Amino acid sequence: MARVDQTPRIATKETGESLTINCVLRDTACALDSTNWYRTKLGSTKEQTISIGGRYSETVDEGSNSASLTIRDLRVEDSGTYKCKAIDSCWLRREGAGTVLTVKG
Amino acid sequence: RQWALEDFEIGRPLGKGKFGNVYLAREKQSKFILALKVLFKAQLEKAGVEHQLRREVEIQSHLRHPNILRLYGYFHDATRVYLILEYAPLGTVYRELQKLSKFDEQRTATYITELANALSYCHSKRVIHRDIKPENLLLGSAGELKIADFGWSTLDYLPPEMIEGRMHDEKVDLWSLGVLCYEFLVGKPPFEANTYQETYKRISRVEFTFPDFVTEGARDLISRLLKHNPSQRPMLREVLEHPWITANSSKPS
């Protein structure tokens, strides 16, 4: 019953806005403390790492056992599918189901 | 941990590491021969690197390329973590340099081609490596090179921008290729010195010289890779196309 719930699952934004993605690790005491973030551009399936900095920021909440990614000043080129992936403090693999972002614009 | 210890036959040790040993192993259903790396949790938590290692193993688990050591999976029990690895039968590049002192131009150019191929794949996924040392390169059945340290994002191998505490990016990987090309042809890295302080200064001021036997083609490539300004180093595509590389390499891009 341990699982990662990643929300929102689908998101539509306009150029200039912001998006926050939340990944919550439920039903376990294992810590979600090592999250790496990934994106696949529209049209592709090939996954690229996301570097934290610039328009990209991250927060972690021990109480909710969650990790969040925030992207500011959204551009059309930001559109694609985002995923959180981790090996938690119990050495177990955890992955969110994905956020499909479309930016119009 | 959908994999378990009962899934594998264990053979002889392949070597001893800082946090445990590596064993020859065989997956029972397929009879496939592999390496099983056994890490002791206590040693991990003593060097203070367990959290860092979990981030690195997660990145490694996505990398599939002929010149990157494959991670097939991982599992654990109460005291140990097990990594399921590709078996590299011919040992490290470091040991080969010990046995030969230095490499001829064919072996050097072939190794640099294989490394440039791997790093081009990594850059396509926005993955960069830290410093790359000969001890971190294993050799496969056909003598092909494999990047084996999981070092994804030791003074003699670091670029000027990093020891000067400046900004850095994928261009650090080109500096690494320059240091290794020199070390393969000459037998030692180009900024080696007696003290930490001297080495630091040599790197920062790009102070190195060539033995006279190093050919014009090799000098040209090394001099282009070891630029102080990161933005002046070539693209990986330009390395793979360099006339010294194509004249000497026994493998393609």
Ligand SMILES: Nc1ncnc2c1ncn2[C@@H]1O[C@H](COP(=O)(O)OP(=O)(O)O)[C@@H](O)[C@H]1O
């Ligand atoms: N996948 C592998 N295939 C064959 N031999 C290996 C493999 N991994 C490690 N070895 C051998 O065992 C030794 C273990 O070293 P390593 O695992 O790199 O230790 P550490 O974790 O301290 O760096 C290596 O020097 C190498 O000779």
